[model samples]
Target chain A: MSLNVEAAHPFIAARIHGLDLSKPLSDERIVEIEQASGQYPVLIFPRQYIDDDQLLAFAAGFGPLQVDRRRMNNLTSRRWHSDASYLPLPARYSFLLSYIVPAVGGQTQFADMRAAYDKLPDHLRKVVEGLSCHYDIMASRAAAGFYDASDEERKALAPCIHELVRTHPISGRKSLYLSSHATHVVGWPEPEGRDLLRELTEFATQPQFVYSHEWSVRDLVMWDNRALMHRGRPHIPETDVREMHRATTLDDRTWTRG
Target chain B: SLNVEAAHPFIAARIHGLDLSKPLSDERIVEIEQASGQYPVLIFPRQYIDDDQLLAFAAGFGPLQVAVRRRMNNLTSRRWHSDASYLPLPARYSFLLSYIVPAVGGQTQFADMRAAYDKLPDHLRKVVEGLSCHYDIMASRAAAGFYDASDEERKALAPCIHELVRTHPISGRKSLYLSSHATHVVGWPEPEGRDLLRELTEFATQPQFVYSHEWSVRDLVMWDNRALMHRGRPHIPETDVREMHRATTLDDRTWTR
Candidate 1:
């Protein structure tokens, strides 16, 4: 089948047409999508009606699936973060499908890290390029009051180190790899490291580099975790039901300083 | 076909099964006038009418003030504001009929200023009680880069002052009478006044106090300008065509000093 790949946002996302996610895709079709993701980073498949098994099957085509049990409930925070960033091999790509969307407000906003990196001032770029960050999911979860890990939980999810800036395996373009989970920079004081990370987050999420996805029922979105940071905007979880099913692909490329 | 349904808990109501194209009796007009005060934002769905019909329908309430705009074009900024708040008289009610609406992200949001005022912290309420705001249409336009007012235009649109809190004439409920056109608090220093304005604006526009209405092609929405502040949300300017006509009723004759 001929696929239509059109830009949804100028630099970050593309809307993919002429594909059904409920069924399996051909290897040739999968290869085309894999290449498209390198350039666009986020792919939107509108009006898709796929079940959990189908979603996992489709996502598994990219790599081994990393199903997040924490995301199944309302315990997750609304802050920006890449999926499984606390793990040794974080998510390479994440697929989210909306089942029931709210009447208003629950939009998912994505900030292009590649564009954020490109637009950073030379001094800031130089500072981050040489740095590696400690991403601790527990630290971020505690800040939001979403979790308080047990001793075993803490040990299982010990903070992992990743480059402050990551190079895309396909495009080879440098992207800022920081999120809410980036607790501190390696070899730097916590206060100073946090200040720098906060500054970078604010700068990266400037309106120009962000795209807000207003979800509709049956809309599926697949985003490259290495190239973007995403967060959900406010909505009353008690009053409104916004159910989404997510499946993530694990990073198989050589570990970036694990 | 006359039914009134509440749209939101605090702000809007939908008048289902009403055809605006038909002539309304004095009794119907009176019912609408009373309902407008209670609901603030009244929406009439599927009433496709031309400009003359829109004018005729609006005339049932009161004399229509002149409100001019483009046929179809890109919307400018989306700042929460009351219609013509820069005017000393100001608009009493605004009627907007949408001919074309975008498929996505071109909804209008109305914040219940009456509710906002009622929920205002005691300290903030006391601060606003006796204060007046200075509004300049030219200043607002200039700040948004819409246009540089000519000498004649500047003179015609000079700054006007209004009380920061005013009671709605029909409902007799107090509401925050602030708008994006309001530049500063009268007699207060510029910096401190601006900070207060920003803080109050943020407080007044919290998600709890707002009702966002997604538009349909033939929807006609009329709101009591004194009871609420409204703004348009973002849409793709290049592709989306959101065409609408507006008619505002004059309040100066009825308003007391």
Candidate 2:
């Protein structure tokens, strides 16, 4: 049977119906899922009944496994940022499968970053094309509360240089790349660099470009950070219980270290 | 019982069957306030509310005014910072009413710093006691990519100082106070204090302490800013007309020290 895909938002989100995540998907079906993910940054697979292994198997078919580097700690509030934007190996696609959902809130929000990039005014877009953002891992480290990164984490940390714009490896689309860890512009005064970055941020985060998704139990929600950004919507009612798990596909191109 | 329910494993909650545009019966007011304390962040996602209607509702609970910071600015620790950590007097209640919402993304997030504090390992808690941090909006603004701000503007936005470890005067339970405005820890060496502040912020914003709110048209969201840290969810769909308005209320107690 054909995949029953339902469009949910104007920019880039959809709900794929009538699929049992519990059962193994065929190779052809897997390819279809990836293609569907390419066009829509956020895909909501409702009524999915699967475990972590199944989720990893599906993600592995797309690319090398970042190895289920699930979100650890810090479930307190969802901050608006790209996963591992500070690291060289940023998450290309991140998946969260809900098992327990609060009756009221815990909807994950996503913004189409490609849409943010595509619609920038001529002057701002031109300026970003020529500039590179200088990223400092220290603050991004602090922002995430990793004050005590291990020696391995210190040694393995890569790519202090990131372009303000990037080309996607899969879709071949060019989009704006903003890092929560960005410090200043290369070869520019700190203040001047920030002013220009400010202009771009304002355009990209405007409301029309976002999709706020409410979660239901057994629903697996995934998003592509290459062209999208997201944060946790913590409207979950206190009395309700919410539990979830994550599996990430390592999209290392955004690092631009090589 | 107020019939309040838990919305997540921790943090966030909901109160059903109450309309705010109209005055709450005296009986409902007491339970709502109690629910307000129980649920640090309470949202009525489908409740159709307008600015005046929202003002009317919050007015019944506490004095209210529109939020000065119109948008979520994440350039600094701003993405994960509290609403108004800059002033000696910070806000108490935040009622954000979204009149128009995008088809996708743009959900607001709230983090329970109180939960962040309680969950820290004993060793971590020991490290944070008796420390203070200097909060500067300009410093945070500069870090996030806004350099064009005038020196005069930066000057008036003088820094505010607050304890790094805050105790709820009523409950006496402690929590780690974090904000993007927090620049450096007090009495610490260069970058060392910043290092400490970074650690706390990172710990406080974890998923366990967080709840993300999805908005529906006319959704009125309320939260206790005193104990929680919140930020705007980010995404990309650059060409839609999304407009939302918010009102804020200051707490009765201001930190003089």
Candidate 3:
């Protein structure tokens, strides 16, 4: 059956209809969905009540599922950042199946990195042309007062460096790749790098480039990590229940030596 | 979490739980880039990826270097070396996706130059410090009996000099950057430099720092050219088709701006 894919947000997201995700998908259907993802970046499939196995099976059609070792959701995820930016092979696509939603808040917001790249002032673009930023997991944790790394852990967790402006592997489209996990610019000094990062974050997360996904029960949302940055909006601590089950696929196609 | 286990005591690691055929995110690409800095060599087994996919994957690292006009056949590859080291910028990381594997022989071997540099005797280390090597591809190719260079091509193949004891751009670790393409030491006497180069090559490729990878079908092996030197073990080309597609990412970090 032909799916109806309509733009959900003016900038980045699309709402998809006409497929039962509970069952297995055809090869052609998978190809169609993959193409749509490249174009839209964010996809919404509302009211699809699928179990964990079904959700996993659907996600597997695209790529291998990332092992979610830590399920604990502390307050750290409330910051505007991309998921798993510190990993050697970070998450490519993330699927969130909403099981519970708060009445007042708890929306997952996304910022279009592609849009941000396009709107970047010419001077900023030239400044970031060949520059790479270093993303540190320990720094992110330390910022939130969640945990600090010991000497051994610090040695094990090496910071990942990525280009400030990255090209999409498939579409060849360029985007600004940034995260709260970013520690500093590779060649730039710490103080100046922090200021630059703060400035870029401020510019990228502007309202025009962002779309808040106010989720509902059984709403399955998927997003391309290459095309955007995302964060979880906080709900009222005492009254809200924002239970979510998420499965992310690893971005393994990049040439990493083992 | 990604399972990156060491394939050998010294050098390469085998990364599990990754499918190389799919599109990778920028974060994942960065992760791989970071991992390569530490591990130097990484092996991904059973990744059934095609040429276009391999090209796309390699491109994520930096920019893909086009395969030069001359193909270093299996015979020439038997000698220990890093790919494209004669070039001014040189190769940063190289990916070899194996499509056909021979039942016997044709193993690829790697030497951990970082470990080699670390274990260098103080006297020898002192002698080699502040030294550079002149690498000429045409000279090496001629020695290997691969091809005869035309006068015009010989002019284009001028020797490129690099530090003999080089520091890695990412890991901040020092490594010996010797290659088969290295013709001689930059300022040393010819015979003396040849002796030093041969002695260093011998010391670096000793069994302790080496990992010999026996290729299985669809094994994609990636290695940092800056940290390790690799060579293909001999195999009978007439009997078996040990076919593979190689993609290398240019080293922008090490180049002179």
Ranking by TM-score: 2, 1, 3
Clashing pairs in 3: A88-B31, A88-B32, A89-B28, A90-B28, A257-B42, A258-B42
Q: For residues A42-98, what per-residue lDDT tens digits would candidate 2 score against the true structure?
A: 889997788788888766665556751123233312545676676666677788999
lDDT of 2 at B56: 72
Model 2 chain A worst lDDT run, 10 consecutive residues = A68-77
Which candidate has the highest DockQ of all?
2
Ranking by lDDT: 3, 1, 2
The CA lDDT of each predicted structure is 0.80, 0.70, 0.80
Q: Is the docking of candidate 2 incorrect, acceptable, medium or high quality?
A: incorrect
What is the C-alpha lDDT profile of model 1 across A144-196, one tens digit per residue?
A: 43354579989999989998888898889899997878877899856457656
Model 2, TM vs. native: 0.53
Give the TM-score of each candidate. Answer: 0.51, 0.53, 0.48
Off by over 4 Å in 2: A1-131, A134-258, B25-27, B65-78, B150-156, B169-172, B254-257
DockQ comparison, 2 vs 3, better candidate = 2
